[PDB]
Structures are given as C-alpha cells and as structure tokens.
Amino acid sequence: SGQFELEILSMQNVNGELQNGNCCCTRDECDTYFKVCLKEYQSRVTAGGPCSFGSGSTPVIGGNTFNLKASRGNDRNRIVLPFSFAWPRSYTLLVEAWDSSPDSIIEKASHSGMINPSRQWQTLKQNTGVAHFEYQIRVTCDDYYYGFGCNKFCRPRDDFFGHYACDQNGNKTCMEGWMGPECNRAICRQGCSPKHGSCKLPGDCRCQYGWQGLYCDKCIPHPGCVHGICNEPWQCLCETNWGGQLCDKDLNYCGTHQPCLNGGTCSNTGPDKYQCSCPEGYSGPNCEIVD
Ligand SMILES: *[C@@H]1O[C@H](CO)[C@@H](O)[C@H](O)[C@H]1NC(C)=O
Ligand SMILES: *[C@@H]1O[C@@H](C)[C@@H](O)[C@@H](O)[C@@H]1O
C-alpha cells in the first residue's frame, strides 16, 4: 500500500568524536551507521516512545566523513519503512548517527512535519552540533494505490468482475459497452425495452417471458390466436368481426363469404351465420333460384 523512504546524503565528523565527547582524534576512524524511528506527529517530541510507523538501521556506511550526494543510493545507505495504513500526512521522524564496535551515538536528529505521496525527495539537514549529516525523505504509493493516503486501490480489469481502466485519481473508467461503479453492467441495444429487455453482454437485448422483438417491446399473443391482438403476454383480444377466446369465430360471414346471389342483401346472425333478402323474381336461402 505505501512506503516512507529515507536516504543518507552525507556525514561530516571532522573531529571523529561521539555525542558524549569521546573518540570512536587520529586513533581510529568512526564506524558510522544510521538508526531511524518513524511515529505519529508529536506537538512536543519525546526521545523514547514506540516507533509506530516503522524502525530501521543501516549497516556501516562510511568513516568519519562521507559524501554520497553524487552516488546512487542502494540497500546499504537507505531505509525503507513500508505501511498498510492510510498515510496520515503528518509524522515525527527520529534519525540518529551511531558508531559500531559498546555502540554509542555520534549525533541525533528529529523532524516533525507533513508529507504527501510523491517520488520527489525532501532534503533535510543536521547543522547544529559537532557532527553534521544530511539525508532525504519521501512517501511513495505501491502499485495500484492512489490518493493522499496511498489507500485507494485500482487495478484495470476485463473479466467477470469488471471491464475498466484506471483514472489518474484511481477511479474506474468503463470499457465501451459497460457501465456501473464496478463497470460490470452491460449496456443494452439502443432501443431495448427498459421494462422487458435485459443484458449480460453489451448490445444483446434478451426478452422477458412473454415478450419478443429486436427491442423486447412486442407481446407474444396467446398460442392459437388468429385475427386477434395483445397489449400484454398471452392475450388474444379480437379485431372487428372476430370472436372467441382464440378469435377464430367469424362474426361477419357476410362481408367475408358473400353468400347471396344475383344482387341480394345479406345480413349477419353470429358465428358463421347469415340471412339473404332476395330481389325481383328470386328465391332460396342464397337467392339462387330464378323466379
Ligand atoms: C473520483 O475520485 C474522487 C477522489 O478519489 C472521488 O471522491 C470520487 O467519488 C470519484 N468518482 C467516482 C465516480 O468514483
Ligand atoms: C338489398 O336488398 C336486395 C333485395 C337488393 O334490392 C339490393 O340492391 C339491396 O341493397
């Protein structure tokens, strides 16, 4: 989730002394190493206290005086303090220069401040006292982590869980045809019924039971429906001159069949039924008999 990094830049111990006053002076060279303690911001800085955000120490870097400003900074001259919590922005940093081979302090430093995730280094100096030392600090985010606390996670996906890439703010930007916060809801065919149509995959309008068409907006009439319509699934509402549950009964056998012959007037009597009114010199149920 994140790392606080500390790099040693330089040490200047001209006299090759210690914090007490003793020598590690042409007797011997100081075996200079660094101890680091990182905790919560303190308005009134304590010497002790637990190192809540991390503790660490370097192996022997150099002698009495060394300059690493033009050098790279490797596993030996730097300390990495990782963190899984949200970066609180504010911190209290304790950096100490120590001599190896009983161990005793050379110079002690403390710094209370505020820092945001950034690859850019912040140089800090210990100018007071006999021994002078420089160092640089920074807080960087781990891969897929965003925000001021290096706590916002975003990894691009094109699978079961989502189809998106990540913003500069670690916000999900949906792939074409996807929507929602997790970018896992497919965008249906343009015109697809909001009531009876649904997705699974982009531009694929799947019909609700009893609905049909390219847009799932047309009801399926009751099976066996002839001369009837529907507004709802399984309906079979008859058109003019049609009757019955399935709209199969002809209520206008007259306008259909035209049974009366030689210009006679036809009248209805219900399901497939008629009546003929015959002209001059005509007889029969269908006015077929002349005279
Ligand atoms: C975009 O990122 C900002 C900052 O993290 C957040 O407050 C906002 O809710 C995000 N927008 C969306 C749509 O997720
Ligand atoms: C209906 O009745 C028959 C007898 C004819 O006169 C037709 O012209 C009429 O429309």
Numbering used by the authors: 32 to 55, 66 to 142, 148 to 337
Cite, word for word, the article reporting this structure.
Signals are initiated by extracellular interactions of the Notch receptor with Delta/Serrate/Lag-2 (DSL) ligands, whose structure is highly conserved throughout evolution. Here, we demonstrate that the N terminus of human Jagged-1 is a C2 phospholipid recognition domain that binds phospholipid bilayers in a calcium-dependent fashion. We expressed and solved the structure of a Notch ligand fragment consisting of the full N-terminal extension, the Notch-binding DSL domain, and the three adjacent EGF domains from human Jagged-1 (J-1N-EGF3). Our structure demonstrates that the N-terminal portion of Jagged-1 folds as a C2-phospholipid-recognition domain with strong structural, but not sequence, homology to the Munc13 C2B domain (root-mean-square deviation [rmsd] 2.7 Å versus Protein Data Bank 3KWT, 10% sequence identity; Figure 1B; Cho and Stahelin, 2006; Shin et al., 2010).
The C2 domain packs closely on top of the Notch-binding DSL domain without altering the structure of the DSL-EGF1-3 portion of the construct in comparison with our earlier structure for this region in isolation, and therefore extends the near-linear domain organization (Cordle et al., 2008a). Many missense mutations that affect this domain of J-1 cause Alagille syndrome, a developmental disorder that is usually associated with J-1 haploinsufficiency, and mapping these mutations onto our structure suggests that they destabilize the hydrophobic core and prevent correct folding of the C2 domain (Penton et al., 2012). Sequence alignments with other Notch ligands suggest that the C2 domain is present in all mammalian Notch ligands, with conserved residues mapping to those that play key structural roles, and residues exposed on the surface of the domain being more variable. Since the strongest structural homology of the J-1 C2 domain is to calcium-dependent phospholipid-binding domains (e.g., the Munc13-1 C2b domain; Shin et al., 2010), we investigated whether J-1N-EGF3 binds Ca2+. We first used a limited proteolysis assay, which showed that Ca2+ (but not Mg2+ or EDTA) protects the J-1N-EGF3 fragment (but not a J-1 fragment lacking the C2 domain) from tryptic digestion. This suggests the presence of previously unrecognized Ca2+-binding sites, occupancy of which increases the degree of structure in the C2 domain.
